[PDB]
Design a protein around this motif. Sequence first.
Motif, short mmCIF file in Angstrom:
data_model
loop_
_atom_site.label_atom_id
_atom_site.label_comp_id
_atom_site.label_asym_id
_atom_site.label_seq_id
_atom_site.Cartn_x
_atom_site.Cartn_y
_atom_site.Cartn_z
N UNK A 151 0.83 -4.44 -11.75
CA UNK A 151 0.05 -5.05 -10.68
C UNK A 151 -0.78 -6.24 -11.18
N UNK A 154 1.17 -10.22 -12.15
CA UNK A 154 1.32 -11.14 -11.04
C UNK A 154 -0.01 -11.81 -10.68
N UNK A 155 -1.13 -11.08 -10.73
CA UNK A 155 -2.38 -11.69 -10.31
C UNK A 155 -3.04 -12.49 -11.43
N UNK A 202 -1.20 1.79 -2.50
CA UNK A 202 -2.16 0.96 -1.77
C UNK A 202 -2.41 1.50 -0.37
N UNK A 203 -1.36 2.03 0.27
CA UNK A 203 -1.49 2.80 1.50
C UNK A 203 -2.52 3.90 1.35
N UNK A 205 -4.78 4.34 -1.05
CA UNK A 205 -6.09 3.82 -1.46
C UNK A 205 -6.88 3.27 -0.28
N UNK A 206 -6.24 2.46 0.56
CA UNK A 206 -6.95 1.90 1.70
C UNK A 206 -7.19 2.94 2.78
N UNK A 209 -10.31 4.72 1.36
CA UNK A 209 -11.51 3.89 1.34
C UNK A 209 -12.17 3.83 2.71
N UNK B 206 -10.14 -0.32 -4.90
CA UNK B 206 -9.37 -0.33 -3.67
C UNK B 206 -9.16 -1.74 -3.16
N UNK B 208 -9.23 -4.42 -5.01
CA UNK B 208 -8.38 -5.12 -5.97
C UNK B 208 -6.92 -4.75 -5.77
N UNK B 209 -6.63 -3.48 -5.48
CA UNK B 209 -5.24 -3.09 -5.28
C UNK B 209 -4.71 -3.58 -3.94
N UNK B 210 -5.53 -3.59 -2.89
CA UNK B 210 -5.01 -4.11 -1.63
C UNK B 210 -4.96 -5.63 -1.64
N UNK B 212 -3.98 -7.14 -4.42
CA UNK B 212 -2.76 -7.37 -5.17
C UNK B 212 -1.52 -7.09 -4.34
N UNK B 213 -1.57 -6.08 -3.48
CA UNK B 213 -0.44 -5.68 -2.66
C UNK B 213 -0.59 -6.12 -1.21
N UNK B 216 2.67 -8.76 -0.45
CA UNK B 216 3.96 -8.57 -1.10
C UNK B 216 5.06 -8.66 -0.05
N UNK B 223 2.26 -2.57 6.14
CA UNK B 223 1.22 -3.16 5.30
C UNK B 223 0.11 -3.77 6.14
N UNK B 226 -1.96 -0.91 7.59
CA UNK B 226 -2.94 -0.35 6.66
C UNK B 226 -4.01 -1.36 6.27
#
Lengths: 297, 287, 50, 49
Positions: A151, A154-155, A202-203, A205-206, A209, B206, B208-210, B212-213, B216, B223, B226
Amino acid sequence: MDLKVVVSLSSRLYTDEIAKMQQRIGCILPLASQNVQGLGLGQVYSLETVPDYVSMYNYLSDCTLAVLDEVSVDSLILTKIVPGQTYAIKNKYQPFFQWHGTGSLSVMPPVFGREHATVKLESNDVDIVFPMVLPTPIAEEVLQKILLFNVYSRVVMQAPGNADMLDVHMHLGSVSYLGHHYELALPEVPGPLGLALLDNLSLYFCIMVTLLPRASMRLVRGLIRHEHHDLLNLFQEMVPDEIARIDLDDLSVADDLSRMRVMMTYLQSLASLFNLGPRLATAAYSQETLTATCWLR
Amino acid sequence: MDLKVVVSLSSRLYTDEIAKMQQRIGCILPLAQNVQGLGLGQVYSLETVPDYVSMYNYLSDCTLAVLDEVSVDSLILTKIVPGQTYAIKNKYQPFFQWHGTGSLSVMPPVFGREHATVKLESNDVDIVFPMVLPTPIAEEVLQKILLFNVYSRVVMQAPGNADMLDVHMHLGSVSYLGHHYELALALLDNLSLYFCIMVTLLPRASMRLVRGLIRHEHHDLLNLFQEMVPDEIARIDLDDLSVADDLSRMRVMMTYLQSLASLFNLGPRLATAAYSQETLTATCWLR
Amino acid sequence: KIHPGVAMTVVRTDEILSENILFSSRASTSMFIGTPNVSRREARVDAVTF
Amino acid sequence: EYRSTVNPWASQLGSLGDIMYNSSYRQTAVPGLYSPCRAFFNKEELLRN
């Protein structure tokens, strides 16, 4: 309960390969169900694609495993992993991992280089790469490190001022171990199914959150206001803007129950997403002959 | 195959040792044979603090065993194969319930240390049996003890924010399958701390990961759906922090989320089929 | 003790531990009884359970 | 028999030499490490004899 599963070849396994195949006796191999291709990990980890460590992890976790016991010429025998049976496994892997505490062993793809767990088969047009076996916590931190690199490459590339691309290649770097540090192989592009795994993560995680327990925010603000704990050393006595601004409200007893309930079910779902790949519980590993007796956990 | 394990006791025993094995014949204990390290008797030694994560990772490290008999010197017990089914009773200091629960849990006793620790003055082995309890009971009592010790440490920091009566009205009363149970009261302190740093690191991780993704799949239904839900107050403060501290935050975040996910999974996961009320026993296999 | 405008009918269940006389006729059932099997379960070195 | 103690900072019940090595004050100690004066200052084995 049959175990003696032979795999018939179609050509002569020459004596340059019989030596290194008899060198790899007691290791673990994944099965297809035999045919000469698809019995191993070279069918899904070829030189043409990027080493993605997720699609091959999917092939390790979908299909079952097998111990190699004897290699004859022109044919070799394999012994399956059916549960309820105690299998004896020797540590015949080139990055050595001493099993002192004898934790739950865990399969992995060769993320420490293809070259250590490969075997060159010139009988048939096939190459077989062996899966890597190692205890559970090292395996889980390898998973978290390879997804963090997948992850973050790429960033770090996405910044226009990429003055530090090599920062993550040493920061992630080796694996975290006391007796020796073991560097691994790092792919630039995570590939399709690795990105699908990060998408599902990410699904999750969000979704989690959307419900944060506000009660622990007061405790970590107090521990900042109190003495700096050594677990708090990642903050270096700083209150960030987010934790300062999620604490304008009050603390009650109403939200906390439903919060922690859906956190229970979502953390059990995350353990189910991290119970990933077949694992082996270990009892009575005898170090003097390097055999870890395991049943399929 | 005899799955029975033999353990020789050191010295001679006496009467209430027989009474307390007759009390604890039905309940079970983990494993490592050596009479010192039989179960959790190397974690409940008071010269160290009885912690939850060390005891839990030991319990997940070692196997499990059913105590069966104690003679003048022998400790007849059998262990747990995943293969065949054995018989289990309650014989526990909380006497909770068995109403047909198809999923079980084995946790160390958070209700009482001395409630499951049996002591002998002639034999200092201080052996102890972790509390077997059904899965909704298990998750309800772990929530109602974790949030309780969180509130206790928060009142210890500042008592003006949290009270005790409105939390004893709700967080002391587990209720499952018509039955209304009552419970109230270091190990839960550090367990809460791990959750405390995980839920305070989950915001930055959270976003940072959203981030990054986030693009995509350049037009995804899932996506974007969410992305439409979570907090507008959350997704602002990311780019200010340096690289190495950020990745160290994510690394410690991932280690303890994997630890707390495997910890919120109920460890030794037993499974029952048919429970008899009049004998207080059920048949169980390892799952 | 003013009687209100509505009448009530109390209903209570009374659990009773009774004794039951059981009868059967002559030659009611037919018990096919087989010879029991013996299986050594515990091969303990102190006392063996069959 | 002409004096009481050669040193008083380890011989009395709450001395420095006692609280460094008694069993009652090592309840926060690391249980693994070895200390030779635990064979002298420990209350249980001094009273076991």
